[PDB]
Amino acid sequence: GSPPEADPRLIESLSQMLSMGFSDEGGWLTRLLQTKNYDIGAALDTIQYSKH
């Protein structure tokens, strides 16, 4: 079996964020990937919030 509707690539990116120390205000650690096209690397800049 191999349903393309499992989003198995989100857990991967979510896995690296699990060892990061991120937040989840709007529970984005799960939807972020979905919203930021799993670009946690690019989202990292928004997920690590380094602006002032």
From Swiss-Prot:
Effect recorded for K36Q: Mimics acetylation; leading to increased ability to bind ubiquitinated proteins
Induction comment from the UniProt entry of this chain: By proteasomal inhibitor PSI and prostaglandin J2 (PGJ2) (at protein level). By phorbol 12-myristate 13-acetate (PMA). Expression is directly activated by NFE2L2/NRF2; creating a positive feedback loop.
Q: What domain of life is recorded for the organism?
A: Eukaryota
What does the UniProt record report as the effect of altering G27S in this chain?
In PDB3 and FTDALS3; no effect on polyubiquitin-binding; decreased ability to undergo liquid-liquid phase separation and formation of p62 body
- Outcome of swapping P3L: In PDB3 and FTDALS3
Consequence when changing E25K:
Decreased activation of NF-kappa-B
> What modifications follow translation?
Phosphorylation at Ser-23 by ULK1 destabilizes the UBA dimer interface and increases binding affinity to ubiquitinated proteins. Phosphorylation at Ser-23 also primes for subsequent phosphorylation at Ser-19. Phosphorylation at Ser-19 by CK2 or ULK1 promotes binding to ubiquitinated proteins by increasing the affinity between the UBA domain and polyubiquitin chains. Phosphorylation at Ser-19 by ULK1 is stimulated by SESN2. Phosphorylated at Ser-19 by TBK1, leading to promote relocalization of 'Lys-63'-linked ubiquitinated STING1 to autophagosomes.
State how changing G41R affects the protein, per the record: In PDB3 and FTDALS3; loss of polyubiquitin-binding and increased activation of NF-kappa-B
The chain residues annotated with the modification N6-acetyllysine are K36, K51
Q: What is the effect of changing M20T?
A: In PDB3; decreased ability to undergo liquid-liquid phase separation and formation of p62 body
Compartments annotated for it: namely:
Cytoplasmic vesicle, Autophagosome; Preautophagosomal structure; Cytoplasm, Cytosol; Nucleus, PML body
Q: Which residues form the UBA domain?
A: 5-50
Effect ascribed to mutating K51Q: Mimics acetylation; leading to increased ability to bind ubiquitinated proteins
Note the effect listed for S19A: Abolished phosphorylation by CK2, leading to decreased affinity for ubiquitinated proteins. Abolished ability to promote relocalization of 'Lys-63'-linked ubiquitinated STING1 to autophagosomes
Glycyl lysine isopeptide (Lys-Gly) (interchain with G-Cter in SUMO2) cross-link position in this chain?
K51
Question: Which residues, if any, are the signal sequence?
Answer: none
Q: What does this protein do?
A: Molecular adapter required for selective macroautophagy (aggrephagy) by acting as a bridge between polyubiquitinated proteins and autophagosomes. Promotes the recruitment of ubiquitinated cargo proteins to autophagosomes via multiple domains that bridge proteins and organelles in different steps. SQSTM1 first mediates the assembly and removal of ubiquitinated proteins by undergoing liquid-liquid phase separation upon binding to ubiquitinated proteins via its UBA domain, leading to the formation of insoluble cytoplasmic inclusions, known as p62 bodies.
Q: What clinical condition is it connected to? A: Paget disease of bone 3: A disorder of bone remodeling characterized by increased bone turnover affecting one or more sites throughout the skeleton, primarily the axial skeleton. Osteoclastic overactivity followed by compensatory osteoblastic activity leads to a structurally disorganized mosaic of bone (woven bone), which is mechanically weaker, larger, less compact, more vascular, and more susceptible to fracture than normal adult lamellar bone. In a cell model for Huntington disease (HD), appears to form a shell surrounding aggregates of mutant HTT that may protect cells from apoptosis, possibly by recruiting autophagosomal components to the polyubiquitinated protein aggregates.
Q: What is this protein called?
A: Sequestosome-1
Which species is listed as the source?
Answer: Homo sapiens
**What range of the intact protein is shown?**
387 to 436 of 440
